[PDB]
């Protein structure tokens, strides 16, 4: 898609994933967080550790990633690599022996 390729190129030409995606620094990034539990893989009574398969639906608005759909043939949504953008650093506080944060950087629906 030439339209979608141009859109992706123009969105990220000077995008910064370091700063928060607010218009003004006094604003608060409001992130909707929904835990989906896909599978209770294991309960380890002896080690007192529970292994679960989950999805963390995180939703927030990035002020810089708006576009006008009529500029790009009516493209209203795109999928982009999540490593490109700023993300909330949600950490599992009570991690026992897994990863603290997300490690599977699947695509972002923008």
């Amino acid at each position: 898609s030439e339209h979608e390729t141009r859109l992706v190129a123009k969105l990220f030409k000077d995008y910064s994933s370091v700063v928060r995606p607010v218009e003004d620094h006094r604003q608060v990034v409001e992130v909707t967080v929904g835990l989906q539990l896909i599978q209770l893989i294991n309960v380890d009574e002896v080690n007192q550790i529970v292994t679960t398969n989950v999805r963390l639906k995180q939703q927030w608005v990035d002020y810089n990633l708006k576009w006008n759909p009529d500029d790009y043939g009516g493209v209203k949504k795109i999928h982009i690599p999540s490593e490109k953008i700023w993300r909330p650093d949600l950490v599992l506080y009570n991690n026992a022996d897994g990863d603290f944060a997300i490690v599977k950087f699947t695509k972002v629906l923008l």
Partner: antibody
Amino acid sequence: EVQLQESGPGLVQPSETLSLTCTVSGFSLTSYSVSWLRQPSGKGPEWMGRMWDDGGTVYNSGLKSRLSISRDTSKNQVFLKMNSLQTDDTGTYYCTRDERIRAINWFAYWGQGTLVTVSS
Amino acid sequence: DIVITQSPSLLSASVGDRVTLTCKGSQNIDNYLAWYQQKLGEAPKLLIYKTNSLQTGIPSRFSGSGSGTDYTLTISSLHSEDLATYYCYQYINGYTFGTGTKLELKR
């Protein structure tokens, strides 16, 4: 500095084809997008399409079949061509340089506009 | 697309008056609204974008305000050169233009 000048026929017959040339000076087409606007008689303006700086094009979905846009970066000219003309197409046609912020675009400078009359 | 309406349709004001032109959308325009000035037989000139960013070289007497679906252009001191038609337009969802407010010196 920035100037745009539309040119073309003042009268065109219905079902004929219209061609307009937007001459450009003070900036390079390779770094600024050029949109085309028309103001139908007794109506507010409407956006027709854009020539991107990268040379791509996008058109108003109502006019996409009727429109084509091309450019010559050496002459600094943008060409609008339209077919299946009808009396409703009579109005002032503008070419505009478009400013940008990220993916958002808006019309920043207008040409003087060429009045096109569609009548037999 | 976001439908836009302007008021007044025709406004008469004396030189030096403060005047405000109102622009209202059918939907949240998200401050992606711009104002441009048009004169008979003259190329339209952008005055303001993003509802309050003054275009370079425009007299500072022009100022913009608004949020959500209501926006205003203010001319704090009407000069004789400012008699023209003013269109607001929106560029966050499609491209829609107001009907335009025609501004004439009071007689």
